[PDB]
Amino acid sequence: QIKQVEDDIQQLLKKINELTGIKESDTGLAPPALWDLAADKQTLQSEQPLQVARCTKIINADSEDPKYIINVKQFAKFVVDLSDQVAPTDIEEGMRVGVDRNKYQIHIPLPPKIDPTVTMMQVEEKPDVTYSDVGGCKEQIEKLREVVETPLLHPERFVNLGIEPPKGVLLFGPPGTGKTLCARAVANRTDACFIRVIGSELVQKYVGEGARMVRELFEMARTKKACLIFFDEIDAIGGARFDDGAGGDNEVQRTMLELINQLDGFDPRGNIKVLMATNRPDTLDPALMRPGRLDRKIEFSLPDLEGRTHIFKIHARSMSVERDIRFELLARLCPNSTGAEIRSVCTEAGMFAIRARRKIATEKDFLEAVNKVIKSYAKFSATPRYMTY
Amino acid sequence: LRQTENRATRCKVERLQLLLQQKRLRRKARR
Amino acid sequence: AYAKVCLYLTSCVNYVPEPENSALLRCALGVFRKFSRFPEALRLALMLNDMELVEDIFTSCKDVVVQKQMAFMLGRHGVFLELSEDVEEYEDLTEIMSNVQLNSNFLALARELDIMEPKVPDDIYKTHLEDSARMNLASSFVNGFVNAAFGQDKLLTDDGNKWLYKNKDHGMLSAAASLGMILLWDVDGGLTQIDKYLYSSEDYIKSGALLACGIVNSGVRNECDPALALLSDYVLHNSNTMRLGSIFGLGLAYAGSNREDVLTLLLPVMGDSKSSMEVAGVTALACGMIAVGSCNGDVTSTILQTIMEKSETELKDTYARWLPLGLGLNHLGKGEAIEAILAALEVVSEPFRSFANTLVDVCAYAGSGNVLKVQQLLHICSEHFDGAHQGVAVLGIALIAMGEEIGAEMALRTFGHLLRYGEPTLRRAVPLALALISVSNPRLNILDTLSKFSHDADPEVSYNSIFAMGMVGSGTNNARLAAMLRQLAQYHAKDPNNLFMVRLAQGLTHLGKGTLTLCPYHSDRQLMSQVAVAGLLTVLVSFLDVRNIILGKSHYVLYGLVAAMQPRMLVTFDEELRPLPVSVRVGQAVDVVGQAGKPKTITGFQTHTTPVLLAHGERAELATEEFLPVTPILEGFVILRKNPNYD
Numbered sequence A: 001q002i003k004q005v006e007d008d009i010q011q012l013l014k015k016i017n018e019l020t021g022i023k024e025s026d027t028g029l030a031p032p033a034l035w036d037l038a039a040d041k042q043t044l045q046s047e048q049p050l051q052v053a054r055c056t057k058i059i060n061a062d063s064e065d066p067k068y069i070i071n072v073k074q075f076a077k078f079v080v081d082l083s084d085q086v087a088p089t090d091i092e093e094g095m096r097v098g099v100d101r102n103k104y105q106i107h108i109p110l111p112p113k114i115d116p117t118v119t120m121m122q123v124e125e126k127p128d129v130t131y132s133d134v135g136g137c138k139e140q141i142e143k144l145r146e147v148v149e150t151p152l153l154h155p156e157r158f159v160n161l162g163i164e165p166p167k168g169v170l171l172f173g174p175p176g177t178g179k180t181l182c183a184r185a186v187a188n189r190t191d192a193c194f195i196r197v198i199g200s201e202l203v204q205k206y207v208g209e210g211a212r213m214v215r216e217l218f219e220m221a222r223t224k225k226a227c228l229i230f231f232d233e234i235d236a237i238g239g240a241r242f243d244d245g246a247g248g249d250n251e252v253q254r255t256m257l258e259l260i261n262q263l264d265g266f267d268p269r270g271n272i273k274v275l276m277a278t279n280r281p282d283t284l285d286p287a288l289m290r291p292g293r294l295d296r297k298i299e300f301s302l303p304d305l306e307g308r309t310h311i312f313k314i315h316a317r318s319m320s321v322e323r324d325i326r327f328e329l330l331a332r333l334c335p336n337s338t339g340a341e342i343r344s345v346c347t348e349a350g351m352f353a354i355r356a357r358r359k360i361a362t363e364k365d366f367l368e369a370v371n372k373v374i375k376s377y378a379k380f381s382a383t384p385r386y387m388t389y
Numbered sequence B: 001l002r003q004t005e006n007r008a009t010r011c012k013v014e015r016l017q018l019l020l021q022q023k024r025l026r027r028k029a030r031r
Numbered sequence C: 001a002y003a004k005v006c007l008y009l010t011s012c013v014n015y016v017p018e019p020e021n022s023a024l025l026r027c028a029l030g031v032f033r034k035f036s037r038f039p040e041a042l043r044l045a046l047m048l049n050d051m052e053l054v055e056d057i058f059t060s061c062k063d064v065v066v067q068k069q070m071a072f073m074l075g076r077h078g079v080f081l082e083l084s085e086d087v088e089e090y091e092d093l094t095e096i097m098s099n100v101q102l103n104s105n106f107l108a109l110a111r112e113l114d115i116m117e118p119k120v121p122d123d124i125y126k127t128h129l130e131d132s133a134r135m136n137l138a139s140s141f142v143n144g145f146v147n148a149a150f151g152q153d154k155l156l157t158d159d160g161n162k163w164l165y166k167n168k169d170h171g172m173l174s175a176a177a178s179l180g181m182i183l184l185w186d187v188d189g190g191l192t193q194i195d196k197y198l199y200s201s202e203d204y205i206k207s208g209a210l211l212a213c214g215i216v217n218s219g220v221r222n223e224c225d226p227a228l229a230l231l232s233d234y235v236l237h238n239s240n241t242m243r244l245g246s247i248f249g250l251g252l253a254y255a256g257s258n259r260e261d262v263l264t265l266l267l268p269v270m271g272d273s274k275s276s277m278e279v280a281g282v283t284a285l286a287c288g289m290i291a292v293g294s295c296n297g298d299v300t301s302t303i304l305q306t307i308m309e310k311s312e313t314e315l316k317d318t319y320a321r322w323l324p325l326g327l328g329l330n331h332l333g334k335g336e337a338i339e340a341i342l343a344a345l346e347v348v349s350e351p352f353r354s355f356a357n358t359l360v361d362v363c364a365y366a367g368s369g370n371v372l373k374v375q376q377l378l379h380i381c382s383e384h385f386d387g388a389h390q391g392v393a394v395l396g397i398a399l400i401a402m403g404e405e406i407g408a409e410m411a412l413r414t415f416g417h418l419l420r421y422g423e424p425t426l427r428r429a430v431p432l433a434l435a436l437i438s439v440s441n442p443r444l445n446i447l448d449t450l451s452k453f454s455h456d457a458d459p460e461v462s463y464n465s466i467f468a469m470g471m472v473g474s475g476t477n478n479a480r481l482a483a484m485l486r487q488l489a490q491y492h493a494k495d496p497n498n499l500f501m502v503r504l505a506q507g508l509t510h511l512g513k514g515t516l517t518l519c520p521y522h523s524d525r526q527l528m529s530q531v532a533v534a535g536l537l538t539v540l541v542s543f544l545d546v547r548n549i550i551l552g553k554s555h556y557v558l559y560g561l562v563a564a565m566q567p568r569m570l571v572t573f574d575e576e577l578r579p580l581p582v583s584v585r586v587g588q589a590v591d592v593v594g595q596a597g598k599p600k601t602i603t604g605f606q607t608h609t610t611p612v613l614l615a616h617g618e619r620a621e622l623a624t625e626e627f628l629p630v631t632p633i634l635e636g637f638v639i640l641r642k643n644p645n646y647d
C-alpha cells in the first residue's frame, strides 16, 4: 500500500494548494496567508504616495509662516509649506523632505540617501567563526578584542579613567595568518553594526564615485550608534600618493584621501571603529598609517612552534585522528608555515586516509600530508615574498 | 499577629537550617 | 538482532496507535531485560509509567555504579523512590535520587565555562546601542531568568531593598521570587537570605520571599522537608487576603513528590471557599503540580466539588481555568481513563463545558499522538463560537502532537494554516501552542513565523508571538534571536504593554546566561517529564488570557515556569561520585537507516572535556575507548568506568 499512500499524500498536497494558493512567485507575490486585503484597500485609499524631494532653503525661517524650497529630484523645484501634522523642527535644510503631489506639502521627513551598493555592506548574517577558532596569535586577539569589543561592551571602565580608547586597527601580515579570520571572529562576536568593505569595491568607473561612496559609508555609520567598519584588502585603494607624470592613481588616491578625511579631519569621526586588513602594509599611505587613523597596528606574523601546535589542534579537533598525534612533531616539522598551510596539511591527511579507504587518519598520513603541502608545494608559497612585503 | 508569625518563622527556620547543616556535615564526614 | 528489535520497537511505539504501544513496550522491556541492558529497561519502564516495574528493575540491579546512574537518570526525570533500607549504598542512591549536589555540579560547570560574572538586565538589554513599574518588573524578571540557579547577581544580592522599593505593587512579589529563582537548585543556604527578607513589614515582600523559598526548593528534594514547614506556618490561618505566593511556592517546591501531607494541606485551603477565586485556582494548580499524573481520586473529587460549588458567574470569570487545569495535571498522560471525569464535566455546566472538557482531555492525552483525538480538536476548532475552548484546543493539538518528530513539524504547518484561516481567539492562542510544540529548540520557521506575527496588528497576538519566540529560544542564547528581540524592543519602544513581553523574551532566551532548557522531554527525544510539561502547560494556559493574567497581577505562573527548568548537562563522575574530566565528542545526528540503523553516529565532532554544555538535539559520545559508559545514552550526569579490556 506504500505507493497508494504516496499517491494520496501528493494528491492531498495538490488539493491543499489548489484551495489555499499554489504558485505566484513569477511576479514576486507572497503566499496568501499574510494577505490583509481589508487593510490594503484602506492603505491605498488613505495613504497617498509621496514623492521624495530635498528641502533646499527655508525662506523666512522665523516664527512667521515660513516657506521651504523643495527640489523634487529630476522633476522640478517648488516653494511649499508644511503639513499641519508635521512640526517645523522635524525638518532641516538638508533632510529628504518627502512631499506629496497636489500642492506639494504633506511632509514626511526622510533619511539621507544611501547608495544601494553601500547599504548592501552591513553584515546581516554573522560569520560562523569564533575567537576560539583562531590559534597562535593570543596577543593579537587580545589587542583587537580590546579595541573593537571592550569599549562597545563596558564603556564605564573607560569613562571612569577618562580614556579615549584607540579607534582604528590595521591587521597586517602574509597571505594567510588569521587577518580575515579575526575579522570574521570580530563580526561574529560583536553586538553592533558591522560593515564589511572590500578595497576592490571602492573602485568605480566615474571620477568622484569612490569618494562619494566612502562619504556615504561613513555617514551611514554615523547615523548608526555603534559601528565597526572593516576594510579588507585595503591595499586596493590605500597606496602612497605618487606624482608620476600622467596622473596615475589620481582617482584611487582621491577616494583614499576622502577616507583619510573621514577617519580624522575637521569633524568628530563619531563612534566608528575601523579595521584595515592587509598583506602588503608597505604601500599604504603614511597619512593612512598615522595613529590618528590606524591606532593599533597589529602584526599577524607566522605562528611560532606553540602557535602551530595550537593551530594543528584546532584544525584536527573534529577529525578522526588516531591515538598518538604528535602535533608538536608536525609543528616543528613545518616551520615558517601559515594557518592555511596547516589546515591544508590536516585536510590532505584526511584525504590520504579517504583515498586509502580508511576511517582513521594516522601519523603516517599526516607526515605524507606535510610532505605534500609544505615540501612539494613549497614553490607556490607566498610567505617568501610577503614576509619582505 | 504579624510579630507572632515572624517569631515563629525565625525560631523554626533556624531549626530547619540547623538540620540542613547537620545533613551537610554528615555528607562531608562520609566524603 | 538486538539493534533491529529495540530500534524498531521504539520507533513503532512512537508511531503506533494506543492499544499496541503498551504491548510493544512490554516486549521491548522484556528483550532489554533478557539481554541485560538495565538502563534501557529503566528508560522503557519510565516512559511506560510503571513505577512498580521501575522499582523491580532498580532493585534487581545489583551493581552499585549502575544503580547510582539509574538514580541520576530517575532524579533528572523527577521521581523520589522510597527505597527500603537494604540496597547497594542506600544513602548515596537516595541522595542521588533526591538530586542533591546539583548546586555544586552546576557551579562546577559554570567555573569550567566561566559564567559566574553576573549579568545585569541592562547588560542584556544593551540600551546604549538602541516605563516605571512595568520596566522594573521586566528587569527583575530577566535578571532572575539570566541568573537562575547561580545564587549570584548584582541587583538583589547587592543592595536589594532599593530594587524592591523601585518595584511597585506586585513588583515586590516579582523581585522576591526572582531572587528565589536566582538561588534555585540547592542554594538552601539561601534560606538565610530569603528568611531575613521575609522578616518584613510588607505583605507583598514577605509572601514573595515565601514563594522564593518554595521555588528554591523546587526540583530539590531534602529529607529535612525545608518547604512544608515555612509554607504551612504561613498558610495555616491567613486564608483571606492573597495566599497565592504561599500556595504557589509550595506547589512549585514539591511538584512530582506527590506527598500526602502537602496534598492534604493544599486541599482544605481550596475547599474552604473563604479564599478568593484566585487562591482557589492557584490551589487547584498546586494540587495538579504536586500530583502530575496520578488518577488521584481525592484531587479529582475536590476539583469536581469546587467546580460545582463556584457560581455560574464565578466560572465565567477568569482564573477558573486553573481548576480544570489542575484536574488535567492530575490526570496527566493517563490516557483514556478520564471518561468519568469527561462525563462529569459535561454534566456540570453547559458553557464552561467546552473549556474544561477540552483542557482535561488534551492534558490527559498529552504526547499520545491520537490522530482521531486531534481530529476532534480540529473539528472543535472549525466550529467557531462567534473562544477560550478554541485556544485551549489549539494548545491541545500542540500538546498531543509534540511526541513525534514528523507529527510535530506537520502540526507546525497546521498551526500556520490555523493562523491563516483563524478567528481572533484562534490566532491569539496559536503562538502559545506553537511555542509548546517547540521549547528551547530554535527552528528557522518557528522563529520566522513568530517574528512576523509579533508585528501583527492584534496586540494580544503580538504578545503571544513574542513570548512564544522567547520560549523557543529559552536557554539557548542565540545571536540571531537576541538581535531579533533587540530589534523588537526598538520597534515597540513606546508600547510598554508589549515592551514588557519583549524584555521577558530576552531574559528567558538568555536563561542562566545559557545553561538550561525548558523543553519537557529529555534524554533522547522520547521521555516526557510530567513536572516540566505541567509547568509549561500552566504558563501557556495562563497566557491564553495574557492581559488580565500576566500583564495584570498573576505572573506567579511565569515563576511556576520553573517547574520545567532542567539543565543541558554532560558532567561525568567517578564510581565514588568524583569529577572525571574526559575528552568527549559532540554532534547532532547522523547514520544510515538500513533495516534499523541506529541514529547514534555524530558527524559534527567537537572534542570537549566534561563538563560539557551540549545544545538541543546533540548527542555527545566518548572521545576514546578508555572509559566505558554505564548509560548507553550520555545525557545529564554520567558515571564512567575504566575499560578493563584496554585503555
Ligand SMILES: Nc1ncnc2c1ncn2[C@@H]1O[C@H](COP(=O)(O)OP(=O)(O)OP(=O)(O)O)[C@@H](O)[C@H]1O
Pocket: A133, A134, A135, A136, A137, A173, A174, A175, A176, A177, A178, A179, A180, A181, A182, A277, A278, A279, A311, A314, A338, A339, A340, A343
Ligand atoms: N592563526 C590561525 N588559526 C586558525 N586558522 C587559521 C589561522 N590562520 C589561518 N587559518 C586558516 O586559514 C584561513 C584563514 O585565512 P585568512 O582568510 O584569515 O587569511 P588572511 O591573513 O586574511 O590572508 P590573505 O592575505 O590571503 O587575505 C581559514 O581556513 C583558517 O582556518
Ligand SMILES: [Mg+2]
Pocket: A179, A180, A232, A233, A277
Ligand atoms: Mg583576507
